[PDB]
Design a protein around this ligand. Structure first.
Ligand SMILES: Nc1ncnc2c1ncn2[C@@H]1O[C@H](COP(=O)(O)OP(=O)(O)OP(=O)(O)O)[C@@H](O)[C@H]1O
Ligand SMILES: Nc1nc2c(ncn2[C@@H]2O[C@H](COP(=O)(O)OP(=O)(O)O)[C@@H](O)[C@H]2O)c(=O)[nH]1
Ligand SMILES: [Mg+2]
Lengths: 208, 352, 80, 326
């Protein structure tokens, strides 16, 4: 790394700095005084103080990236969000007065809930001894399950069975399916939850 | 509803209607604009279930010039110019909607760049073997010209005998609609049918039967270069296309009884850098010499009132779904990121 | 296979021919019988028009020069 | 040593590219009417009328399609010479698929129009005779990475061995691009393959509309007639590098074309290997221009599958219409 160990990561949150001195605890006050001394790294291209910033969508865009082509990945992401918005407006305009109160049109709410519906709770970790790798059920950490939801969505949208259907349209359809607890990604979550219940023999190894 | 105006008649818009949106009826949308509107504005029309256009200074000035036009003087060329995505196409659409309500005969070319690139069926004209025909591009235009001007096709009548084939001809005094039909049924005679139509409209308007509006978007295509090729892979010049050759005659101010309104466009242009928007730069020496003398009209980014009203229109359609978009800080961020450019603002608001 | 290039001179130019043709037609429509192509081209509006055109053709094209051309053309074509 | 991009490679089509309207757009070009007149003189019927307007069922018959394709290919070469002389001047390679090979040699100055056309006529007639001799056919198959072709051929033979027939034939007949082959032989074998596609892992399966099993041993009776037809003919040294269909390499000496042209009749077509031989090169090296002189655009698609970078500089000579009336 070109940065020394001294350099610390920056904090881009904009409302943190405006917190009044009165609300500061002695511990938070000490941390604020300590950051005064430290060297801080330059903020990387990416996250900003903008109010439309969304870390989850940024990570999804980075996971769709191929060959460092960030312009194309962000273009695909915004096309997907626009497509979800337009499809929900289409469904809302054709819906009855009493079905309009339950149609979500915010594409960000749909994206977040769709990814949340695809997160697994349990997974399997192989462990090595005796020459035989042993598959033990494990409760997945929050980071791991958030990553797996995104990876499953992107792999599902990269399947070659979707011939000439463009990625924004495939991804919007998959997101709207997962928003309603349907589709192949929810089934992939279920098939891991069942294949972890089929192997509860080694269910109590707590030291993966 | 501070961003809307109840005056939906373009014959009565003025400086007090600046920045406000007026609604174009579905019937007007189907008749006047089968082909004119930008590809990304028809998406908004389909999603909002309504077509509302803002009133701006460019269109108001161009409407003032067209209300006080003298139909005895030679036709005056008005050229809309401005940076990319500043709204000159929708200004031209506002003017076309004004003229269509006043029973002008509309000659609307929605994008002239399509006639000089990506042509698959290119023929050699039987009328003149030194020119090339574009049947798919001429028959596509004839259908929409028929749609816009259905009423006049029976009132207007040709003044010469037109011979399509040894078997088939249009005899003097037949309604112009027949000519249009001959181009829509047999595409082989589409390009010949367009020229005849032009040759008629330019002549009869001089006689005073009707007023003619020649609306051409992306007019810089006519005096530039093409990306079409022969079978020997040699370049083709724009004047060798009959469809482009016949449309240049309309830009010359050798007829009266109408106006020629046009808009430049770098989008879709060939061999022009991205930041070229000025009249000479886009037109070329030949284009400027052809259009000279003409009245240039500048289209700029939104001023604060127009920008605020555009975001209020989007908020009224519930098109800004982010929770921070309605707030003042969200408006400042949209303003900075778009810099009040209508196209950038629309694209940013699309996915919020 | 020599080639020659030079600056813009308004005289014997396409802009001169076009404006002369347009003004002859405007007079004909006005019903005036005034076809002297020196009387038509010796006004003060033609001086401003040729100044604007020569500027646009020889110097850089900016929006100020485009607006000067606009105003000269408007005065010549009786647009207000 | 010219940079790749100035030189040109001419590809000649073969069986299956026939289409009604063939020849229009080539007649008014120089020297084509005389070629069709010579075709009349050699054949004994008016090829011109059949190609221009025919029922398509006479044109689909083996005795007629091959001479038509040969003549149309050479007419297209004439048209290309007229439009772009430099393309013909800077020619490095030539190749034909099944009968187009006979065209390529004629283009390369190894044979003449009359002798080549007579050879093609005898070939077509003999192949048709052998086709009536025993029922046979051709089937195009596109496979997956899990597909086994020789294996599928073995059970395709096991079925009709159980039925009972002398030395049943079912072998891969055309190598045209990766995982896409054409198998040839008895109908029952190809029928078995159609209904066991799923077991054999075939994505798509399509019977070729041909009379019989070309490029297999079933066409052994047609070898001897064509063989005789080539004895009188004196083949010269090809001027350009003409590539063979038996082993997919250049014809090196004239003393071996006689036997390779007859072995092709009962040998699988090595088209993929020919494309590799003509276009394979290091990444970043430029490719030559490619012209499909003849009807259709099939070889264009096959080249697209075989080598995309070579396909980027591909163009076809249109034989159904012309932009300018010469
Ligand atoms: N007068 C207007 N009323 C409403 N929306 C407008 C107006 N002008 C521009 N817009 C918005 O801006 C978008 C782009 O405008 P438009 O197509 O007219 O641009 P343009 O300046 O003609 O662009 P180009 O250089 O690409 O031809 C339109 O789709 C619409 O969203
Ligand atoms: N087939 C056919 N086309 C015609 C006829 N008359 C006009 N046109 C078409 O309409 C256009 C009229 O343009 P025109 O003023 O006559 O210019 P010009 O033909 O080059 O001298 C021509 O380009 C033709 O394509 C006609 O009598 N027969
Ligand atoms: Mg535009």
């Amino acid at each position: 790394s070109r940065y020394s160990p001294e350099f610390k990561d920056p904090l881009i949150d904009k409302e943190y700095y405006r917190k009044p001195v009165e609300e500061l605890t002695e511990e938070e006050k000490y941390v604020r005084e300590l950051k005064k001394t430290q060297l801080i790294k330059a903020a990387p291209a990416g996250k900003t103080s903008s109010v439309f910033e969304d870390p989850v969508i940024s990570k999804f865009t980075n996971m769709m990236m191929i060959g460092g082509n960030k312009v194309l990945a962000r273009s695909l992401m915004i096309q997907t969000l626009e497509a979800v918005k337009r499809k929900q407006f289409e469904k809302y305009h054709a819906a009855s007065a009493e079905e309009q109160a339950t149609i979500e049109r915010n594409p960000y709410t749909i994206f977040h809930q769709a990814l949340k519906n695809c997160e697994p709770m349990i997974g399997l970790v192989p462990i090595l001894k005796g020459g035989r790798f042993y598959q033990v059920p494990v409760p997945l950490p929050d980071r791991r399950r958030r990553f797996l939801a995104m990876k499953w969505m992107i792999t599902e949208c990269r399947d070659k069975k979707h011939q000439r259907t463009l990625m924004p349209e495939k991804l919007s359809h998959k997101l709207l399916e997962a928003f309603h607890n349907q589709g192949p990604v929810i089934k992939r979550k279920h098939d891991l939850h069942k294949m972890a219940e089929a192997n509860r023999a080694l269910a109590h190894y707590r030291w993966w | 509803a501070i961003s809307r105006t109840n005056e939906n008649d373009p014959a009565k818009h003025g400086d007090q209607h600046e920045g406000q949106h007026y609604n174009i009826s579905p019937q007007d949308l189907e008749t006047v604009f089968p082909h004119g509107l930008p590809p990304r504005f028809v998406m908004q029309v389909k999603t909002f279930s309504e077509a509302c256009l803002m009133v701006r200074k460019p269109a108001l000035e161009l409407l003032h010039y067209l209300k006080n036009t003298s139909f005895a003087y030679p036709a005056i060329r008005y050229l809309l110019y401005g940076e990319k995505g500043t709204g000159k196409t929708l200004s031209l659409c506002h003017v076309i909607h004004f003229c269509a309500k006043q029973d002008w005969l509309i000659l609307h070319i929605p994008d002239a760049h399509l006639w000089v690139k990506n042509c698959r069926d290119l023929l050699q004209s039987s009328y003149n073997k030194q020119r090339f025909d574009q049947p798919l591009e001429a028959s596509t235009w004839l259908k929409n010209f028929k749609t816009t001007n259905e009423r006049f096709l029976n009132q207007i009548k040709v003044q010469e005998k037109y011979v399509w084939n040894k078997r088939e001809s249009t005899e003097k005094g037949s309604p112009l609609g027949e000519v249009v039909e001959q181009g829509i049924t047999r595409v082989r005679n589409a390009t010949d049918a367009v020229g005849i139509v032009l040759k008629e409209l330019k002549r009869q308007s001089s006689l005073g039967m009707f007023h003619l509006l020649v609306a051409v978007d992306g007019i810089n295509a006519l005096w530039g270069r093409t990306t079409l090729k022969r079978e020997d892979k040699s370049p083709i010049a724009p004047e060798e296309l009959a469809l482009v050759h016949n449309l240049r005659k309309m830009m010359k101010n050798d007829w009266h009884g109408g106006a020629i309104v046009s808009a430049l466009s770098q989008t879709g242009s060939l061999f022009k850098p991205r930041k070229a928007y000025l009249p000479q730069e886009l037109l070329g020496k030949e284009g400027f010499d052809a259009l000279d003398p003409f009245i240039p009209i500048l289209v700029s980014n939104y001023n604060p009132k127009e920008f605020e009203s555009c975001i209020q229109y989007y908020l009224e359609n519930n098109w800004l779904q982010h929770e921070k978009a309605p707030t003042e800080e969200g408006k400042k961020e949209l303003l900075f990121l778009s810099n009040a450019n209508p196209s950038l603002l629309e694209r940013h608001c699309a996915y919020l | 296979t020599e080639a020659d290039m030079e600056e813009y001179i308004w005289e014997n130019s396409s802009s001169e021919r076009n404006i002369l043709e347009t003004l002859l037609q405007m007079k004909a429509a006005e019903k005036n019988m005034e076809i002297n192509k020196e009387e038509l081209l010796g006004t003060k509006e033609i001086e401003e028009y040729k100044k604007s055109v020569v500027s646009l053709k020889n110097e850089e094209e900016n929006e100020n020069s485009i607006s000067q051309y606009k105003e000269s053309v408007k005065r010549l074509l009786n647009v207000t | 040593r010219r940079m790749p991009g100035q030189c040109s490679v001419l590809l000649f089509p073969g069986q299956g590219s026939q289409v009604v309207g063939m020849g229009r757009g080539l007649l008014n070009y120089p020297r084509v009417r005389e070629l069709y007149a010579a075709a009349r003189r050699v054949l004994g019927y008016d090829l011109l009328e059949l190609s221009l307007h025919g029922p398509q069922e006479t044109l689909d018959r083996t005795v007629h399609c091959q001479p038509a394709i040969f003549v149309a290919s050479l007419a297209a070469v004439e048209k290309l010479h007229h439009l772009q002389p430099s393309v013909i001047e800077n020619c490095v390679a030539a190749a034909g698929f099944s009968v187009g090979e006979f065209a390529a040699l004629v283009f390369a100055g190894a044979m003449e129009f009359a002798e080549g056309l007579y050879a093609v006529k005898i070939r077509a007639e003999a192949m048709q005779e052998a086709s009536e001799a025993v029922p046979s056919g051709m089937l195009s198959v596109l496979g997956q990475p899990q597909s086994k072709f020789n294996f599928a051929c073995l059970e395709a033979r096991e079925h009709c061995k159980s039925l009972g027939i002398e030395n049943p034939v079912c072998e891969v007949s055309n190598y045209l691009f990766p995982d896409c082959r054409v198998i040839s032989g008895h109908q029952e074998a190809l029928r078995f393959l159609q209904k066991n596609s799923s077991k054999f892992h075939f994505r798509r399966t399509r019977m070729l509309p041909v009379s019989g099993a070309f490029h297999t041993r079933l066409m052994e009776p047609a070898v001897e007639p064509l063989t005789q037809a080539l004895k009188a003919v004196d083949i010269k040294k090809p001027l350009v590098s003409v590539y063979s269909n038996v082993h997919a390499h250049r014809y090196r000496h004239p003393g071996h074309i006689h036997k390779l042209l007859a072995q092709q009749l009962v040998s699988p077509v090595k088209w993929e290997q020919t494309m590799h031989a003509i276009y394979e090169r290091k990444k970043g090296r430029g490719f030559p221009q490619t012209f499909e002189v003849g009807p259709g655009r099939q070889l264009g698609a096959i080249l697209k599958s075989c080598n995309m970078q070579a396909w980027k500089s591909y163009s076809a000579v249109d034989v159904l219409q012309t932009l300018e009336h010469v």
